[PDB]
Amino acid sequence: TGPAAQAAAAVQRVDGDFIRANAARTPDWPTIGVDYAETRYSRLDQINAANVKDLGLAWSYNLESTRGVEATPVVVDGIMYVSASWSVVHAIDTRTGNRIWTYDPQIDRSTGFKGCCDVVNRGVALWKGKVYVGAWDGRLIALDAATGKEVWHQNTFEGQKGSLTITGAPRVFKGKVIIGNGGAEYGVRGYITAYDAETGERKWRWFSVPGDPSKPFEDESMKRAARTWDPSGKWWEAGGGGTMWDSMTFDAELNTMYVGTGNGSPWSHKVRSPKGGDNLYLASIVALDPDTGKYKWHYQETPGDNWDYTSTQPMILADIKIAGKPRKVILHAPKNGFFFVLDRTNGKFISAKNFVPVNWASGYDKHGKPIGIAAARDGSKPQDAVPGPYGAHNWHPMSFNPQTGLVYLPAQNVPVNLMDDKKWEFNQAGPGKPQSGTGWNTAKFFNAEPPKSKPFGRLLAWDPVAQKAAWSVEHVSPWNGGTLTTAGNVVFQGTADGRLVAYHAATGEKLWEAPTGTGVVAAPSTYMVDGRQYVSVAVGWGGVYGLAARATERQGPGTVYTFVVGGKARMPETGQLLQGVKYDPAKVEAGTMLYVANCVFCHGVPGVDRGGNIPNLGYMDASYIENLPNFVFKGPAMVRGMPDFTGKLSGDDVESLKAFIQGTADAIRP
Numbered sequence: 001t002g003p004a005a006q007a008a009a010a011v012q013r014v015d016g017d018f019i020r021a022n023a024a025r026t027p028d029w030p031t032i033g034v035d036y037a038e039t040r041y042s043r044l045d046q047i048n049a050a051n052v053k054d055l056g057l058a059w060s061y062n063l064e065s066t067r068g069v070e071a072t073p074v075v076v077d078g079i080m081y082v083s084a085s086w087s088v089v090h091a092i093d094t095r096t097g098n099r100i101w102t103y104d105p106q107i108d109r110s111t112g113f114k115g116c117c118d119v120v121n122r123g124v125a126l127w128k129g130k131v132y133v134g135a136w137d138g139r140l141i142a143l144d145a146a147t148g149k150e151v152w153h154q155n156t157f158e159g160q161k162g163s164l165t166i167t168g169a170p171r172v173f174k175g176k177v178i179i180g181n182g183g184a185e186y187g188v189r190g191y192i193t194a195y196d197a198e199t200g201e202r203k204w205r206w207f208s209v210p211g212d213p214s215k216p217f218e219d220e221s222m223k224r225a226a227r228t229w230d231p232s233g234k235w236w237e238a239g240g241g242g243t244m245w246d247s248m249t250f251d252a253e254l255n256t257m258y259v260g261t262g263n264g265s266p267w268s269h270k271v272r273s274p275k276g277g278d279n280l281y282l283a284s285i286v287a288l289d290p291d292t293g294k295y296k297w298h299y300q301e302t303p304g305d306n307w308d309y310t311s312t313q314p315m316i317l318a319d320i321k322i323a324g325k326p327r328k329v330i331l332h333a334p335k336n337g338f339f340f341v342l343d344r345t346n347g348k349f350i351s352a353k354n355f356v357p358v359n360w361a362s363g364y365d366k367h368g369k370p371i372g373i374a375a376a377r378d379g380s381k382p383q384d385a386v387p388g389p390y391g392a393h394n395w396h397p398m399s400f401n402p403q404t405g406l407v408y409l410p411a412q413n414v415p416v417n418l419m420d421d422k423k424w425e426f427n428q429a430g431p432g433k434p435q436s437g438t439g440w441n442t443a444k445f446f447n448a449e450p451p452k453s454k455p456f457g458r459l460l461a462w463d464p465v466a467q468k469a470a471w472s473v474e475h476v477s478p479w480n481g482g483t484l485t486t487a488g489n490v491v492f493q494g495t496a497d498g499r500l501v502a503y504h505a506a507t508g509e510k511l512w513e514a515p516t517g518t519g520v521v522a523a524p525s526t527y528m529v530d531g532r533q534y535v536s537v538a539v540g541w542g543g544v545y546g547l548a549a550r551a552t553e554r555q556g557p558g559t560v561y562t563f564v565v566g567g568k569a570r571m572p573e574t575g576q577l578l579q580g581v582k583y584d585p586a587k588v589e590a591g592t593m594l595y596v597a598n599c600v601f602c603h604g605v606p607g608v609d610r611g612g613n614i615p616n617l618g619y620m621d622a623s624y625i626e627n628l629p630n631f632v633f634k635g636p637a638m639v640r641g642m643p644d645f646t647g648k649l650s651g652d653d654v655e656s657l658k659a660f661i662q663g664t665a666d667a668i669r670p
């Protein structure tokens with residue numbers, strides 16, 4: 001009614017000029033990152049360091065999901081849009097806390113296995129009356145802002161090979177809606193595509209890595225890039241990787257957009273490109289002309305990527321003084337553990353400093369190239385990878401407060417040990433090849449020896465000019481949520497252990513907190529409605545680490561929590577180690593290999609891990625393990641994302657899996 005008409009009117013106003021005008025005072029949060037630079041800085045200061053202790057719950061909304069929720073809500077004139085699990089979009093009237101509409105693309109649940117890292121979505125984009133979502137199955141869908149009905153869709157995977165999915169938020173720059181995809185763990189060729197925002201007509205496409213060099217190159221950037229790959233490994237079969245699954249930003253004055261590119265496929269550099277090569281444009285920040293998609297320049301953060309070191313993590317465009325001169329930069333802290341400051345007018349390196357311990361490089365030289373540590377490229381034997389695949393910083397948003405000059409950065413360590421699988425062949429699944437049973441192709445072996453580093457999680461306030469930490473708050477677990485900062489001198493961040501917390505932006509002192517029940521991964525947003533400031537966070541534990549581990553005992557549905565000074569709304573709202581399953585201990589080794597090939601990256605290690613948004617097999621009732629075939633072949637949980645292993649497991653393979661599951665629980669029992 002009133003909500004639908006308000007929604008139509010509010011979203012109709014969203015365009016480039018609107019996003020710029022929203023800068024002087026930010027009453028709305030029109031893009032997932034507030035502005036095109038994606039600073040995630042609100043200029044609102046009604047909630048400030050002196051009164052944030054009086055925040056209370058204004059309302060909460062049930063997203064009804066059970067898997068990860070990674071999106072920051074966007075809000076214009078009190079009308080909120082946020083996605084949940086399986087690409088479902090919700091439009092919420094913040095004045096009542098009630099649903100306006102829900103759009104469910106009805107993703108085939110049997111395809112949950114096609115993505116490496118949970119069935120997530122990092123948000124929607126708004127533009128001239130429509131809401132855009134990148135769906136799991138490859139559709140870019142434009143929805144009517146008032147009704148949630150589809151206006152148009154594009155099958156963005158048409159004609160492209162491999163296990164592609166979409167998890168990121170689209171961006172709309174100058175009337176073109178742009179989206180990438182995920183899949184480099186499986187073997188795909190990364191690309192982004194731009195479509196007309198009004199009609200959906202395809203406008204341009206840019207691939208981040210070259211195709212078969214015996215075929216015409218799509219553009220000069222591809223011909224140039226081919227000179228940095230060794231064709232003896234036929235990289236184009238597996239695809240090469242380079243997926244752009246998360247960060248994109250835009251500078252309208254420079255008429256330049258920027259995209260972070262992903263890791264190599266397969267992960268092992270010696271397998272992917274045998275004789276060497278930087279493998280452009282993997283692991284880079286790339287600048288493109290937003291109108292034509294044409295390459296302008298790039299800066300490669302990790303040449304010869306060999307550890308799943310994506311550069312897709314969220315960058316922030318900022319204007320800061322360095323060496324006493326004004327510089328227009330890009331701030332970026334990707335998985336590899338270095339905080340980069342780059343010149344956004346030309347891609348020139350300014351500085352890089354590690355923000356956590358690292359063991360693949362000792363630093364960057366004066367030309368902006370890493371100085372490698374040899375052992376890290378020795379794939380012939382197990383080697384701890386620090387930061388490793390989970391990343392020193394993953395997609396969880398960071399934020400920049402220009403008044404303190406600090407970047408509030410979620411940092412962590414999840415120990416992993418890697419070595420190369422020199423006998424890997426693309427799509428040839430087999431025992432011991434990690435998750436190959438559902439299409440992964442990393443060409444690595446994991447934890448052939450136990451990693452030695454210790455896990456950690458902390459919120460860093462990083463000074464990009466001095467390239468050092470101004471303050472740090474230690475958390476109990478890795479995989480804490482994204483951040484928000486505001487002119488009220490506060491920083492908001494949810495924790496893996498189940499709280500939304502506000503800290504003083506200058507000191508890191510904790511000023512306020514509330515429980516969220518489940519661990520939080522998405523970053524909050526803030527906005528004004530009828531003269532009052534609200535802070536909202538969409539809570540749904542998940543993402544790749546959240547599939548298998550957790551730091552709260554409690555599990556519940558995805559929920560948007562919204563706080564205001566004085567709110568009074570009421571808040572909404574482990575196990576036994578498996579024992580007794582009959583098994584043959586002699587089959588534990590065979591079961592270990594079959595389990596690593598088919599189950600580990602969703603169910604974790606039985607008993608050792610406790611379960612995240614997917615339950616751990618070492619804590620299930622014995623009936624599930626005693627009767628395992630009932631569950632792995634066209635099981636009752638297919639509708640929830642448990643794959644069908646028909647044609648993948650046979651004979652006595654399930655008995656071997658039982659032996660590994662009960663045997664591992666028996667080995668660690670106190």
Ligand code: HEC
Nearest residue numbers: 112113598599602614615624631632636637640641642643
């Ligand atoms: C992620 C893509 C998965 C892979 C790979 C495997 N499993 Fe799974 N499983 C997954 C989900 C999302 C679920 C449902 C969780 C819920 O209850 O909501 C499951 C569930 C199971 C179960 C319980 C079955 C049931 O009907 O309740 C079992 C026993 C199980 N899965 C076993 C299992 C094994 C042995 C796998 C490797 C062969 C395996 N799963 C892979 C997701 C994923």
Ligand SMILES: O=C(O)c1cc(C(=O)O)c2c(n1)C(=O)C(=O)c1cc(C(=O)O)[nH]c1-2
Nearest residue numbers: 117120167182183184185243245262543544
């Ligand atoms: O290589 C890829 O294409 C790809 C895709 C995605 C994804 O789309 O979410 C992730 C990753 N890689 C990845 O390396 C990673 O650490 C990761 C974590 C998460 C998550 O949502 O928690 N997604 C992804």
Ligand SMILES: O=C(O)[C@@H]1CCCO1
Nearest residue numbers: 116185308389390544
């Ligand atoms: O790269 C991935 O898809 C994830 C990150 C952690 C392990 O595998």
Ligand SMILES: [Ca+2]
Nearest residue numbers: 184185263308
């Ligand atoms: Ca990856």
